[PDB]
Every structure is written in structure tokens, then in C-alpha cells.
């Protein structure tokens, strides 16, 4: 059970892993246009950390986009394949993700949430109240009135993950 950064380098191996992950995302996020998931997942700004089982099978992952200069990242998609849910994989992925972001010198994680997802992210350390200056993401992250923008502060020396 590895949590690796999946690079989109145009190779058969990684492309197959990204597609498998994109398919997990669509199946688990039905309200999302499948072609939209494909666009972000393979674009020049996004990255994916996957949960690899037996170093070959993808069972989940998280797609994100770093805004390095500003020191914050946005979570695009997060999911675990149905038959592997409720086994703690998703929580371990998020902890691994926070650790990696800490090492990438990222100070804040931002994510839009709706309905259940709001409560889900609160348990993962995200809050509705932001401590990060609004004008920092404004102009970089689209501002939708219909969603709840949540943020997780990543302290330079708090130990995330296990």
C-alpha cells in the first residue's frame, strides 16, 4: 500500500494509472462532468497522489493544484474506489497529502465543499473561517457563490500523517 505522486509523463504505465484514477473519480463523483475530471486530471497545473495497492492497482487518490508562489494548493478531486471504502485509506491519504504539502512548502490547503463533504473535511482539519488573507487566493481560485470554500492551515512543524 503506497501513496505516490503520479506523474503525467505520457508513458503507458503512468497514463494507465491516471485513467484508472480518473475513472474512480467519475464513478464516485456522479455530479461531475466526466470530461471535466479528465481535463483537470491531465492538465499542466494539476498533480495526483494515488493509493497504489500491490504497486500496480489504483484504489484511490487525490488530485490537486499547487499555486507555488502564493504558497497554497487547491484540492480538485478526492476518492477511494467503492470496494475499498471505510477501511481508513482516505484518512491516511489526506494525512500523507498534508505531509507532502508541508515538504513542498505549502502553507494552506483550500477546497470547495458541499453538503456532506463540508462535515467530512472539518474532521480532516479544514475550517469555514479562513485565516489566510482573502486577497491571496482571489484571482487564482475561482470564487463561486454556490460553494463553501474551506481551508486547512499547514503549520511548518506539526506532524501530519503516520
Amino acid at each position: 500500500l503506497d501513496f505516490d505522486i503520479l506523474t503525467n509523463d505520457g508513458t503507458h504505465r503512468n497514463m494507465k494509472l491516471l485513467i484508472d484514477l480518473k475513472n474512480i473519480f467519475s464513478r464516485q463523483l456522479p455530479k461531475m462532468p466526466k470530461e471535466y475530471i479528465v481535463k483537470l486530471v491531465f492538465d499542466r497545473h494539476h498533480e495526483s497522489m494515488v493509493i497504489l495497492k500491490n504497486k500496480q492497482k489504483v484504489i484511490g487518490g487525490i488530485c490537486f493544484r499547487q499555486y507555488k508562489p502564493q504558497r497554497f494548493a487547491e484540492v480538485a478531486f478526492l476518492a477511494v474506489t467503492a470496494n475499498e471504502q471505510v477501511r481508513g485509506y482516505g484518512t491516511r491519504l489526506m494525512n500523507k497529502f498534508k505531509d507532502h504539502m508541508q515538504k513542498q512548502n505549502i502553507e494552506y490547503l483550500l477546497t470547495y465543499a458541499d453538503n456532506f463533504a463540508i462535515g467530512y473535511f472539518k474532521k480532516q482539519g479544514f475550517t469555514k473561517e479562513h485565516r489566510m488573507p482573502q486577497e491571496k487566493w482571489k484571482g487564482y481560485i475561482k470564487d463561486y457563490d454556490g460553494g463553501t470554500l474551506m481551508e486547512c492551515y499547514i503549520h511548518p512543524y506539526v506532524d501530519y500523517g503516520r
Binding site: 464516485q28 463523483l29 483537470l40 480538485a76 478531486f77 470547495y112 453538503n115 481560485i141 475561482k142 463561486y144
Partner: peptide, 11 residues
């Protein structure tokens, strides 16, 4: 631009 595909139904 990205948006925030982090969009799950209600569950």
C-alpha cells in the same frame, strides 16, 4: 484556472 471539482452530491 481550475474551480474546485471537489464536488460530491450530498453523499
Amino acid at each position: 484556472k481550475s474551480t474546485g471539482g471537489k464536488a460530491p452530491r450530498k453523499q
